[PDB]
Design a protein around this ligand. Structure first.
Ligand SMILES: Nc1ncnc2c1ncn2[C@@H]1O[C@H](COP(=O)(O)O)[C@@H](O)[C@H]1O
Lengths: 395, 342
């Protein structure tokens, strides 16, 4: 067995998991949040216990220090030498990274170069990589990019119909995200079916606060709904997803919106929150909808419709469908959302078993359906730990 | 009867006089009067159908210039000129056919007030074309249009797709303005909306420049670097221009993605219609759009497609695939007949 730590560094946060590999058992997990802010908090959980303290945490360096000291201070590790590898979530690998990469000087420059494409995430992702290299110098580290799984998209799927120089000189194209989650659940589906992923045409729906759909054919991503940034594609908690682009110049002219306000509009004020007027949380919107709030009911119906439209585009592209996967916090738990998304799909041989769907069984398709419909819990940290093993510990 | 179809472009004036009912032509800005029909670009939510031209109609139109400020004004001007005070007139709106869309199809996932206070929503256009060719299809097949699940592709310099189920438009690809949906001659269609704030920040684009980018510099012209005209791009791709070949592949991909959404929404497909300058004449575009669709029972017959036959699906195919020449002036004249000489 090996001890692999999965790290996700945010602008003011540090998420971590420590896993026993290859079995994937969780030794501990937690979150340091409001780094640099007042009310900074360090949470740490094992299977048996939870510890939580509000205390000043100036920067990510202090966050990493407190984490490493707690690993031994709580008897989780006898020593930091027990750590065999670290996997780092990186938001954007551009076209440079088609797979996870061993951390090294060139990897770090590339990730910082790509800050131009993810300004709020890639720099702190790299800071985390640097802090662990500094504080755990002897532990190999692997960068795992949320974009890499989608680097197999063909040009007619990633080119936008803008003038060519917007791609050629400015890098504007569809990248796609949730790559680690779509890779994880699609591989898990094939393992559960006992067939190679390459034999299946798969549509994968990651439905959480962020939401994305991915088409997987021949074992490779061939399309996915987020585009240039994680703002686009289907409707989400606060993100609009795709809208008529000509709305934005209209709003700049009418309301004088700045670029920053336009992004805030598209990313923080839209989606379930903007339509329902209630909440970004699917459960909250559903609760209001069942009590008669018509905007909330419309929010939920539009949410399912946008996902259905995207599934339909990708079934068309692949020439049919063998399996549909639901994952994420909504896809895993909402029998009602899955039922609305899957309704009236007899032209595909796709129908649900209501009893299986109601209990979120692993497979929820009807007895005589031609399409497998799976509810699979996504585990991005396990996926990252597997990439660490593959690239840092081939032995 | 003699019906006059009028299209008042902001510096032009297309005209057609037809022998109704059978629609024989008597063409204009001249080739070889019971009522006049006026093309109107935007009917908002107010007009679900063509309307008799009266005072009420005319200032409802001129109010909607708040949404179509560069077209509705001189459309209503052309109406007011017709100076022809004894001839009944009817306004035919490019948006009206799509007023049967349900909220799930026309509401954007924006803050609610953008719809509720500013009227921002999907309207859709090419309504008279989609209405015309879908009705003609049902007539050719000899069944009610309400019996068919139809996807209609109007492919010309402007391009749009429309899903028709139960005899009504249930979705269409152009949105708030005619800029959006699929890739076109110079219009980009739908793109990742987050690109635009990025461009404002990185290149200092004004709203005007963003509009010019989306409407005049993108599409076939922007991708190919050759032309906004499909045939010109095709010539260059045939000669080895890689961008031109990519432009044509992306053009078909965008239409296919949209067709797939609409098939999903309708729960299947009975017929696909191609119309417009590209749809009526390009065997290549139709074949690339219809590739590898056996899961729907849709395949093309190469000999029929090559000569643009009225029906081009393979004889073993379940889905009818039709090539129908659109005739919006005839459609307008039929609207005049129905509302002004009933
Ligand atoms: N039991 C549940 N039923 C429906 N939605 C849920 C449930 N639990 C969490 N969610 C939703 O999952 C989303 C976030 O999940 P994630 O970001 O994938 O962890 C939020 O919109 C939540 O409302």
């Amino acid at each position: 067995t090996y001890k692999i730590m999965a790290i996700n560094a945010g602008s003011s946060s540090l998420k971590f998991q420590l896993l026993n590999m290859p079995q994937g058992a969780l030794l501990c997990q937690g979150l340091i949040e409001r780094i640099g802010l007042p009310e900074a908090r360090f949470t740490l959980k094992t299977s048996a216990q939870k510890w939580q303290e509000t205390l000043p945490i100036a920067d990510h360096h202090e966050a990493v220090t407190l984490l490493l000291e707690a690993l031994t201070g709580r008897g989780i590790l006898s020593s930091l030498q027990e750590i065999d590898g670290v996997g780092h979530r990186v938001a954007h690998g551009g076209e440079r990274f088609k797979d996870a990469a061993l951390v090294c000087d060139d990897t770090l420059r590339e990730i910082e170069r790509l800050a131009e494409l993810a300004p709020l995430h890639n720099p702190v992702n790299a800071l985390g990589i640097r802090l662990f290299r500094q504080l755990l110098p002897a532990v190999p580290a692997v960068a795992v990019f949320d974009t890499a799984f989608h680097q197999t998209l063909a040009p007619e799927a990633w080119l936008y119909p803008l003038p060519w120089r917007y791609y050629a000189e400015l890098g504007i194209r569809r990248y796609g995200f949730h790559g680690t989650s779509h890779h994880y659940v699609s591989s898990a589906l094939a393992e559960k079916l006992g067939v190679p992923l390459s034999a299946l045409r798969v549509v994968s729906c990651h439905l959480g606060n962020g939401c994305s759909v991915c088409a997987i054919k021949g074992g490779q991503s061939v399309n996915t709904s987020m585009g240039f940034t994680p703002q686009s594609g289907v409707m989400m908690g606060t993100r609009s997803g795709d809208i008529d682009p000509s709305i934005l110049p209209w709003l700049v002219e009418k309301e004088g919106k700045s670029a920053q306000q336009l992004s805030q509009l598209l990313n923080n004020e839209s989606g379930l929150l903007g339509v329902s007027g209630v909440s970004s949380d699917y459960r909250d919107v559903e609760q209001a909808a069942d009590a008669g709030n018509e905007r909330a009911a419309l929010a939920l119906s539009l949410f399912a419709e946008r996902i259905r439209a995207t599934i339909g585009s990708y079934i068309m592209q692949m020439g049919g469908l063998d399996a549909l996967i639901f994952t994420g916090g909504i896809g895993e738990n909402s029998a009602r959302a899955r039922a609305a998304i899957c309704r009236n799909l007899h032209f595909l041989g796709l129908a649900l078993d209501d009893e299986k769907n109601q209990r979120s069984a692993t497979f929820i398709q009807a007895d005589n359906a031609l399409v497998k419909v799976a509810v699979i819990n996504t585990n991005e940290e396990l996926m990252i730990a597997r990439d660490v093993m593959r690239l840092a510990l081939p032995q």
